[PDB]
């Protein structure tokens with residue numbers, strides 16, 4: 347695969363099920379906390395989907411639109427800026443990268459984060 351689509355997280359209960367599945371496989375997951383009005387988020391999406399393909403079968407990648415999902419799900423991430431790309435493992439957030447700049451550069455910083463926990 348050259349690109350893998352990020353799966354949307356519906357709510358806190360869905361996050362719970364996602365984390366139980368990741369624990370079964372002893373894998374981390376990636377969550378892209380984003381907003382649809384944020385140009386940085388929009389430009390990052392295709393680059394994140396290319397990165398997700400590089401980790402197909404090893405790390406599942408998810409996304410959550412902070413204006414559409416329930417407020418209780420956004421509080422699970424403790425989000426304050428977008429895009430916030432978090433690595434979760436063993437049921438909790440282990441590290442995060444805050445976008446804000448060129449998408450390729452955010453991706454290299456996310457790659458460094460993945461290599462620490464995978």
Ligand SMILES: [Cl-]
Nearest residue numbers: 357358416418
């Ligand atoms: Cl919720």
Ligand SMILES: [K+]
Nearest residue numbers: 424425426427
């Ligand atoms: K925060």
